[PDB]
């Protein structure tokens, strides 16, 4: 695997990919 | 946070796992 | 707005657009 | 929950908004 | 809900989300 | 138009409804 | 080009890429 | 119409191009 | 990481995120 | 192949990584 | 059809659209 | 390559077909 820039909808898409059934949180304010 | 780590900077898929529940 | 039929990654896209700078939590069953 | 409901039936943006932080 | 930048495919994706069955028009030239 | 309102500037989901049929 | 099997938001993505600066109209039944 | 046809059978990019403005 | 259920364009998104600057080859049957 | 397997059953990111160049 | 900028996941999405069943290669390093 | 032709510059759907197998 690699390291790239992941922003916006694309970042949340990658969170879905990696976390799936575990679920996740997206908190940009954090 | 996630935006600074992964959008502004670059992150791995492993680092992205930091934000799984 | 209209009602929504959203599976998989399309649900996360919708939460992204709806929540914006607030972010969101994605919590499937099991 | 919301993830199953939106996929197996339908759901509103207003129901979605409850999962915002 | 919020106000964010929506461009390109992402703007048409949000139009689909909000309009759905009503349909919509995307006319950047407008 | 939509691109100036929503991409160049920012718009709400409500403003996006302006472009529904 | 190849023939296409496109449901939901994937149809709008395809119209976006095909129409470009011309834009398009999205008009489902009912 | 085109939205049903692309989903329930198949459709071409050339058929898609007719819905351009 | 979690196991993945990926059809159509969602497979290509996943290969994109996984392979990054290396790129990838997309090779369906028939 | 991998395109059918990910769609009809499941597949891992580790199986995906084999299709990288 | 048109000529536009296609980058990142969006470029691989367009490759999927145009190539489909033929398959394709994404090699940015090339 | 594809990124220079299609992202940095602009390309047609026809040029994109150059990268089909
Ligand atoms: Cl983008
Ligand atoms: Cl789908
Ligand atoms: Zn994008
Ligand atoms: Zn989909």
Q: How far apart are CA E15 and CA K27, in angstroms?
A: 32
| Resolution of the structure, angstroms | 1.7
Each residue of I1-30: b (16+ CB within 10 Å) or e?
bbebebebbbbbbbbbbbbbebbbebebee
Q: Would you call B16 and A26 a contact, using CB atoms and an 8 Å cutoff?
A: no
A27–chain K nearest CA distance, Å: 23
User: Who among F12, F14, F21 is closest to E25 (CB)?
Assistant: F21
L6 DSSP assignment: I
The Cα G4–Cα H5 span in angstroms is 10
A19/I2 touch (CB, cutoff 8 Å), yes or no: yes
Q: Cβ(K7)–Cβ(K16) under 8 Å?
A: no
Spatial distance between the Cα atoms of K16 and I26, rounded to a whole number of angstroms? 8
Closest Cα in chain G to C10: G9
Q: Are strands A24-26 and C24-26 parallel, antiparallel or unpaired?
A: antiparallel
Instruction: Tell me the CA–centroid distance for residue K22 and ligand 3, in Å.
Output: 25
Q: Ligand 4: distance of its center to the CA of G10 in Å?
A: 6
Nearest of D19, E19, G7 to residue C3 by alpha carbon: E19
Q: Could you tell me the CA-to-CA distances from E26 to C17, E19, E22, G6 in Å, in that order?
A: 18, 12, 13, 19
Which of D11, F1, D16 has the alpha carbon at shortest distance from E2? Answer: D16
- Cα distances from J6 to residues B2, I6, I21, in angstroms, run 28, 5, 22
The rounded distance, in Å, linking the Cα atoms of D13 and B8 is 29
Please give the backbone phi and psi of residue A4, each rounded to the nearest 5 degrees, phi first: -135, 170
Q: Which residue has the tokens 């939509």?
A: F2
Calculate the CA dihedral of residues G6, G9, G12, G18 and round it to 10 degrees: -50
Chain K: residue whose CA lies nearest to H20:
K1
Rounded to whole angstroms, the Cα distance separating F5 from F11 reads 6
Q: What is the DSSP string of chain A?
A: --EE---THHHHHHHHHHHGGG-EEE-TT-
d(CA E2, CA D7): 24
Residue from A14, L8, I14, F16 nearest C13 by CA:
A14
Residue C9 neighbours by CB distance under 10 Å:
17
D21 interfaces chain A, CB cutoff of 8 Å: yes
* H20 shares contact with chain E (CB less than 8 Å): no
């Amino acid at each position: 695997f690699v390291n790239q820039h992941l922003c916006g909808s694309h970042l949340v898409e990658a969170l879905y990919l990696v976390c799936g059934e575990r679920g996740f949180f997206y908190t940009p304010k954090t | 946070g996630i935006v600074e780590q992964c959008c502004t900077s670059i992150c791995s898929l492993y680092q992205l796992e930091n934000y799984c529940n």
